[PDB]
Amino acid sequence: PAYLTAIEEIEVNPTFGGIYIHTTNGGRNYLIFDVSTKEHTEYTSVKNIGFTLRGFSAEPHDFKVRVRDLYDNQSEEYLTTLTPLYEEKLDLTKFKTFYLANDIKMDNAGHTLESLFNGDHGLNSWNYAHGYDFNPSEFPVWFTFDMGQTAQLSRFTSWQRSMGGSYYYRAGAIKEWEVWGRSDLPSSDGSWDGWTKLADCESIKPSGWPTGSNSEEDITYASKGEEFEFLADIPPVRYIRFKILSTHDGAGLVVMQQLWFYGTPI
Secondary structure, eight states: OHHHHHHHSOEEEEEBTEEEEEEEOTTOOOEEEEEEEOOEEEEEOOSEEEEEEOOOOSSOEEEEEEEEOTTSOBOOOEEEEEOOBOOEEOOGGGOEEOOOTTSOOOBBTTOOGGGGGSSOOSTTOOOOEEOOOBOGGGOOEEEEEEEEEEEEEEEEEEEEOOTTTTTTTSTTOBOEEEEEEESSOOOTTOOSTTOEEEEEEEOOOTTOOOTTOOOHHHHHHHHTOEEEEOOSSOOOEEEEEEEEOOBTTOOBOOEEEEEEEEEEEO
C-alpha cells in the first residue's frame, strides 16, 4: 500500500528553519502527510515526495509524521528529534576561481573572478570581476568557482558593478541565471555531467525602466545587494557555476561586483 511504503522509506533531514521530509511513491498515489510538533499537512501524489516545514528555531525539536490516504488508512507515527539548520556567511577567503575549459574568462580590466569574494562592495565601489565581449547568440554562458569547503546552502546575495550607480542594470549586469553545484571535483573539460541545479534567479529592476535609465529606487535597491534563496532539495555542494541566461542590457558581457553565500558548512 502506498501509505505504508511512504512511512517505511521516509527520510527527515534538517533544513533552514525546519525540516525536509522525503519519501517514495512509485505508484503516484495520493498521500496526506500530517506533521506534528509539541503544524502542516502535505497533499501530494508525486513519485519523489519532498516538502519542508519552516518557522523553527535552531535547537533540537521533536517531530512526528503520519501518512494517510483518501481511503481512510493511516500509518504508524514516525518520530525524530532534529536540529534545524542555521546559516552563516561562508568564509569568503576560501573562495577561488576554478576555471574549466568551456567557461567564460572573468580576468579582464585588471581583476579576477576572485574579486567577487574580496569584501569590496557598495554604491561607490570600483570593485568587479569583468568578462570579455561575446555575441549574445552564445548565451547561455557560465563561470565556475570553488567555495573551498562543502556546505548546505541557504541563500546568497549578489551585487552588480556600480562605480557610483550609473553602471547598474547595464554593462555586464546579469538578469536571469541558474546556480548549479557539485560536491566532488569537476571534470577539467567543463562537462555538465555531475552538476546539480540549485536555483533559478532573476535580478529585478524595480522601476522597469529601459536600459540606461535607472531610478533612485533602482540604485538604492541594487547597492544594498540582491537576495536569492536556494532550493531545499539540493545536496551539499562545494563547486559552483553561474549559468548566465540573459543580461539587463542584452549585450554579451558579464560583469559583477560581489557574491556572498550563506549556509551550513559540513
